[PDB]
Structure 1
């Protein structure tokens, strides 16, 4: 029942009890571990236990468990579900829920920040044009001229499931990808399908390497509509290197605001299918993954060549040398332009401190080692040596299928 996690660098052992409150399934069994697999409406009957579980945790959090106000709210919610088949969260409950969804996000190294989250309540939104306005305001608030602030914007909850709010984009800001008659890909190869959907819905594509995609927004189950984020709201950073003058001539840039827009926020059994959220980048996300994944911008070869490395043999570690220089350039460029960024050393150090806090104050911290360990220099970061238990707590952020598969036009 009570489980130990050990840090093999420091010998510090922590005891996890929080996992006993986990509700959802992992995909693992006693026979098979699926730890490395990326992807392993509610009736009145389903909804009340979920609402109760959540309200209990909420009332406990404000030291009012078993109080009249606790029992009265439980009563009110029960009545509302029985009569309307759903219920509405109080603003206080919504903020608490969103913050805890982040707190519970086992794949997030940045959770030391979880209690400093600005929540924008967009449950009064009714149209796609309304969605666009809310998202611009989120973008400007979160960006804050480069001094980034964590934020989430929460659109109306699912009802019968035929009137879902969805942001079709995977992030609020991403670059277009285009199939060339040449056979190669211009721009971000990850976004080729979404770009085609944008063009088919009417977008006039510039056909460049870093074209910011328009938003495709769906309100109340309606067909999604296209909106362009005001260009002056999209803060970008040209990538240069502190030592290599030639680096700037690769013509690289990235955007300052990482903002996930395709996940589902579950609070007290209620499902918020459009809940874009944003923080700030850890540098490896851009320098290792976006730039160096073979299926992304794939720039290692070009950089290695400009460095005049021996590329004849893998054992020269030319890929590794170039990787580090690309990541140095990313961090330097963001820091020089005064756009918030965190390096993987600093972020993982903070996560260990957060884990210790959470064990001390909460009895555990669900964490997915496969995602928490950075994609370069794993074992020189403290999280590599830290055992982690992965389990699913609610409120939560969940992956959901791309809507173009789901949508009936």
Structure 2
């Protein structure tokens, strides 16, 4: 009940007590571990269930500010109880909303970048009423977060769900992503991961420039209405041309990527309240672009072309030509972002940062929920310290959760 985790590279042993405060469920049982299931039913999302959730959240909020069991605490519990009995929901104080957003990041067990959790810039967009207003808020976020390459973490929080018919949703999975179109010859142009979304953009009325790296438009749904298209001003989208510090032919590949990773399709849960539109952003770890975006077989899948340009022996997999090109591709991404002075972290620094964060969380908080399947980078896993680090995965709230894609849900 008081669990130990060991680091097998350093023999460091940490004692976790924080999991005992876990609310939500893992999907595992004592008979089967689902540790590698991408999105079990749990990680996706009445008057009765709402007040215990509010009480739990307010109790931890007032404990964090050392006013647990204080006048202010009891009065707020009273007031929220009062408001819930009446309105069947409630509204967060600005201070509680900031707390809940920072702690939803702090509790994101799949996030390696959480050492930064406390410096999040929270943009309260709860007064937004239309898609045009959502657009305005999202442009201001992008510009704030981008900061001429000196990226700053940010979240923008639109009005909470009420009855589920009045949902605010960003239909894009990230604020900035490249279009994907199926080809007449059978292949795919651009990002294959976004073929379905790119079709719905045209189906909703986009005029695609059918290129390879076309920044998708935003598809914004306010108050449960039909969603609307808006183009992000190009001057707000910081992109990096990808070149290599050795291979001069690298630039001829035509590669670029955007500076700002901005997840926009998740659900933020605070004190039982649900924020279905809550785009957040930080900065990339290099492997997200170079390993996953560029070399996944279901993505831009450039390995075969880069390997040819390197004149590697691609006859037999045992020459490790894939691995050799993978490393060079990732050297170039880091090289390019650093050259253009756009914030980026390599997987060695980020994972070392996370070990220090874990140490801090165990020491000051009693634990740190962590999903090893996601924390370990997708290349060079065992030469990063997280590979040898035992982690306990459990679900704390406030949290970011997954939600169904809107087009499946939207009553039109």
Give the TM-score range, shorter chain: over 0.9
Runs of 5+ consecutive residues of structure 2 not aligned to the other structure? none
Aligned residues: 409
Is the partner of 1:355 in helix, strand or coil?
helix
The CA RMSD over aligned residues, in Å, is 0.9
Deviations 1:199-219 (A, max 9, x none): 011100000000000000000
Structure-to-structure mapping, 1:127-206, within 5 angstroms:
127-206=130-209
Deviations 1:289-346 (A, max 9, x none): 0000000000000000000000010110000000000000000000000000000000
State the match for 1:32 in structure 2.
Answer: 32
CA distance in 2 between counterparts of 1:30 and 1:191 reads 37
The one of 256, 263, 266 aligned to 2:266? 263
Deviation at residue 369 of structure 1 after TM alignment: 0.1
Is the partner of 1:388 in helix, strand or coil?
coil
Deviation at residue 43 of structure 1 after TM alignment: 1.1
Deviations 1:51-102 (A, max 9, x none): 0000000000000000000000000000000000000000000000000000
CA distance in 2 between counterparts of 1:267 and 1:140 reads 26
Q: Is the contact between residue 45 and residue 401 of structure 2 (CA under 8 Å) also seen in structure 1?
A: no
CA distance in 2 between counterparts of 1:30 and 1:57 reads 30
CA distance in 1 between counterparts of 2:99 and 2:353 reads 22
Deviation at residue 44 of structure 1 after TM alignment: 1.2
Deviations 1:98-130 (A, max 9, x none): 000000000000000000000000000000000
Is the partner of 1:114 in helix, strand or coil?
helix
CA distance in 2 between counterparts of 1:218 and 1:267 reads 21
Q: After the TM superposition, which parts of structure 1 deviate over 6 Å for at least 4 consecutive aligned residues?
A: none
**1:16 and 2:19 correspond:** no
Deviation at residue 406 of structure 1 after TM alignment: 0.3
State the match for 1:215 in structure 2.
Answer: 218
Deviations 1:5-42 (A, max 9, x none): 00000000000000001011100000000000001199
Deviations 1:245-291 (A, max 9, x none): 00000000000000000000000000000000000000000000000
Deviation at residue 181 of structure 1 after TM alignment: 0.9
CA distance in 1 between counterparts of 2:179 and 2:317 reads 32
CA distance in 2 between counterparts of 1:129 and 1:311 reads 51
Is the partner of 1:212 in helix, strand or coil?
coil
CA distance in 1 between counterparts of 2:351 and 2:103 reads 20
Q: Is the contact between residue 102 and residue 117 of structure 2 (CA under 8 Å) also seen in structure 1?
A: yes
Deviation at residue 373 of structure 1 after TM alignment: 0.2
Is the partner of 1:223 in helix, strand or coil?
coil
Of 32-41 and 76-85, deviating more is: 32-41
Deviations 1:157-188 (A, max 9, x none): 00001000000000000000001111000000
TM-score by length of 1: 0.99
Q: Is the contact between residue 179 and residue 216 of structure 2 (CA under 8 Å) also seen in structure 1?
A: yes
Is the partner of 2:74 in helix, strand or coil?
helix
Q: Is the contact between residue 36 and residue 373 of structure 2 (CA under 8 Å) also seen in structure 1?
A: yes
Is the partner of 1:4 in helix, strand or coil?
strand
Is the partner of 2:118 in helix, strand or coil?
coil
CA distance in 1 between counterparts of 2:122 and 2:174 reads 18
CA distance in 2 between counterparts of 1:153 and 1:78 reads 27
